[PDB]
Design a protein around this ligand. Structure first.
Ligand SMILES: N=C(N)c1ncn([C@@H]2O[C@H](CO)[C@@H](O)[C@H]2O)n1
Ligand SMILES: N=C(N)c1ncn([C@@H]2O[C@H](CO)[C@@H](O)[C@H]2O)n1
Ligand SMILES: N=C(N)c1ncn([C@@H]2O[C@H](CO)[C@@H](O)[C@H]2O)n1
Ligand SMILES: [Ca+2]
Ligand SMILES: [Ca+2]
Ligand SMILES: [Ca+2]
Ligand SMILES: [Ca+2]
Lengths: 304, 303, 301, 304
């Protein structure tokens, strides 16, 4: 399997990247960075930090856009802290190291990946301004991508930013609907924020975000600490779940409904995932295999 | 005066290119293609067709995007024909050559031309999708451009009349909006479709688009036929006027108004645009030298 | 004058229909629906909407087919908006009530119609997939029809391009079936070139803009998208056919008699081979521009 | 197996019907007749004949259309005669009795069959005008058909009545291409005309269409005399092979290629076979078991 990830790396994106790095089956070919949880400038730095702690300081990184397609840029989100990832220290991890970054726009990079990578899967953990522009520039390139595993859009109503919306797609509703009307929805899988709240763990019942023994475990707990509080003491794996499902497939699926989606770019509900059942649409997951998600999360943080 | 054109090459886009080809104070640094009136593929073809009817094949041509950003593509084969260019036969013009194309995206290549090419200008006869996408990828690049000449809108200001439908901005209002909010409107001149409709000619009364003497006359005469007969027998310069002002500077304008354009990306009217008398806005031209414009129409069609 | 109607209900269709609802010498007997401007179900919805805004949906609405006869269902048509009817908010018309649709196929009901409804006329405002398939199954019935009024065709002969024509190019085999089965002599034809030649300039003409009632609202608010799409021009493609079909020769200034065939190969598949012929079609060339706009206005009282 | 027959009653059509009838395991639930070798008037008359000759006429008979879809009737050299089946005299068979036809139109009976009765199969021995119109009017119901067996085409160069195409498809290539593009080619099997020349019999060395005794032998012999003469003296039994495959499964097929097929709807080649090696396409049978074909031809005419 061969995968390309586009991320606005906050805490949970870094954790998801660790998921895909932990699995030897998974060949990460590029990482692409969009603004969201943290500023593009910080998201590059945060992905550097994670590739450093895991020790796979070899994958390429590309700087995409720093804004939405049409909608105006909003105020820097403090949801993930100043540095955008629990505000960790780079002397408290040894991540005080020159970073790595290419010379191609992540749009240019991902288009290249789509033209050249046989059986390329994408894992989209962020606002999709990149992939949307990528589709509009060279659609005949992007549509070669073997499959789309995307995180975003709270379709059951209740979300994170608005009363009933979702952060990543509200950040660029245009970017999302570009994706949904350009890439074939049958070949995409969608992890919604609602699936993130439905599998939300109690903070004092679960411990895999409070261990030590290696820098992976230290990372996990000190990065997840500040957001665990923002979800009112609960673990809302929005991106870790998108990643877990992407890389394991059918032992992550329990009941995922086939649906066609659309975005609402007009009215007060600018950012609502709206959905209509179809068998030739997206497979949006509604339940998880929770015990196995715990048991792989505990795997990657071992030192053995 | 160096210059880069973006085009949905149908009939007026074609003549507008010929305006910029006749005057040897212009250097077309390149031409960029966007699916607009016709499919993208046809737009590239027709760009070749006019460069060949001119005999200046050494201009590079670049593929772009095929649809507008979020809106459906909405080609108009009832107004421009099927090929996009009036359905003219190429064995009638010696235009059955293979097509010169470059291996780079117009978006990369415009970003590159903005960076490497001092005092460059741009004249946009199409939806602004390519330009928006380049402004999103490398805005620091495109904002080196010394001036934008764009064709779109249906302004009123001091005058009180708005008709119905403009093509270029009703097609990708997202693209127009990105442009209007990212490029300095004070560095922008605007030939409205209302400028076109107010500068109509009854094709009976003037003659500039039925003349026979060369290969460029035969080109313009049979290209313009269908859209002329579809616009009411009327010639409404919508693209030609863009080029006519974009090279002839302040020596082709009669009444220019300064308003702060604001594309409406929501509500009932998603194709319309708002504007208000702003000094730091765009250069919306209301009137132009109609008597001097027809003369360049005649003077490019020589032997 | 008893009259069955086939339509792929777009914006033009709807007001072509209202032409017929407003005439007390016309009795529409059925509406059959085809996938043309929008997918079939949108077409059923907008026929229900038109009948509702006019206020008498006791006229059964039959479903036809969702593709041309052999042509690859391609080229999604969003000219007429997503719902086929200019994207009208149903709350503005109170028409978000359930749909009327009969259980018979429009082809079979067509056939039962011509098999029982005497001096029945036909108005075809759409691709002729339905009409032609009935022609193959049961011609001996459909030929009982006393006249065909069809919209479609763009006789290339002016400078209008035949590439704005839609009805016939959408399913050109359908057109051939008809023009090589049903009498060209008992057939009147409003072309797309006819419809452009009788285009109004919008800015100068006002009949498609009023809000004294629910049909004025319906007309204006549905034609907005087609006008802006058509370059600020009103091209009564459908409505002209219904004008002619309802008002006979009183609606015609000029008309030729032309034998007609469909190209079905090569470069111009959906094009019209046309020849002067005593026993040909009554291809209309010009109508009475005034009494048209009169009737358009009158149906808004 | 429960089977629907669509036939343009010529000589071999009739004997293929006899095949579907000799098997106590293949129930006939309808016969939809349609203009082909002979006019509709004939094919109804002649289906009636085959029924009466065999003894079971309880099978409902419906009338399809009188024409092709778009193409005309062109040039017919009475390959099957004036009545379209060897011009037999019904007084030699006692078939001068009344004819049975139903009230419904063969397309409506067709779609109704496909809508209700289970695991239904189609065997088409004619121009596919009926099935084309029934697919257009109701694709969702014809798509309930479990399998299609069609005699048509000549994927190999030459033809039977065309230098390039085969009669059943050249006659209405529009309907042909309709069924090829609207019904799944993977649930379809094809008896090519070139399969009927390859698998042909030197009538000068084979006898199964020359037997006297019971009326089954009388019928087969006296119908097949003329069309054997017209076909150079060979026996090219297209429809009998089609029914051979449909009724008798894979032990009828020795070799087959799976090819995606398509209709030249243009040019000099109008009506011509088009194929391409495709695993999920169609199943064009190349070499049939010539031995068991003759066995079951002899089993039908047995005195028993
Ligand atoms: N735990 C939260 N409340 C939270 N805040 C922001 N996020 C991001 O939003 C998307 C899902 O909404 C993911 O990509 C996450 O990065 N999550
Ligand atoms: N005025 C337009 N925008 C327009 N252009 C084409 N149509 C459709 O084409 C048929 C005529 O051939 C009509 O009846 C409509 O269905 N409508
Ligand atoms: N020309 C011939 N040798 C010939 N003989 C019979 N036919 C009929 O054509 C189809 C063959 O594909 C069959 O189904 C038959 O009905 N044609
Ligand atoms: Ca994220
Ligand atoms: Ca243009
Ligand atoms: Ca119509
Ligand atoms: Ca046969």
């Amino acid at each position: 399997m061969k995968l390309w990830i586009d991320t606005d790396c906050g805490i949970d994106d870094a954790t998801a990247i660790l998921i895909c790095l932990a699995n030897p089956s998974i060949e990460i070919v590029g990482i692409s960075c969009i603004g969201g949880n943290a500023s593009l400038q910080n998201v590059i730095r945060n992905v550097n930090r994670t590739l450093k702690v895991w020790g796979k300081t070899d994958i390429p990184i590309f700087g995409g856009c720093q804004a939405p397609l049409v909608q105006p840029k909003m105020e820097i989100p403090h949801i993930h802290g100043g540095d955008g990832l629990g505000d960790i220290n780079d002397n408290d991890f040894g991540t005080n190291t020159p970073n790595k970054l290419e010379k191609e726009h992540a749009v240019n990079a991902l288009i290249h990946a789509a033209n050249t990578i046989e059986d390329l899967n994408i894992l989209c953990l962020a606002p999709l301004t990149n992939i949307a522009i990528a589709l509009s520039m060279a659609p005949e390139a992007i549509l070669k991508i073997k499959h789309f595993y995307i995180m975003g859009g709270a379709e059951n109503g209740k979300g994170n930013i608005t009363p009933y919306g979702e952060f990543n797609w509200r950040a660029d509703p245009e970017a999302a609907q570009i994706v949904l009307q350009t890439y074939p929805q049958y070949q995409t899988t969608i992890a919604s924020w609602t699936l993130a709240v439905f599998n939300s763990f109690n903070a004092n019942d679960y411990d895999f975000f409070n261990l030590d023994g290696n820098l992976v475990r230290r990372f996990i707990r000190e990065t997840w600490k500040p957001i665990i509080a923002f979800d009112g003491g609960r673990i809302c794996p929005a991106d870790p779940l998108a990643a877990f499902i992407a890389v394991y497939g059918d032992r992550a699926i329990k009941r995922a409904e086939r649906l066609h989606l659309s975005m609402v770019l007009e009215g007060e509900k600018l950012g609502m995932s709206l959905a209509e059942p179809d068998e030739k649409g997206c497979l949006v997951v509604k339940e998880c295999d929770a015990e196995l998600f715990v048991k792989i999360l505990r795997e990657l943080q071992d030192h053995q």
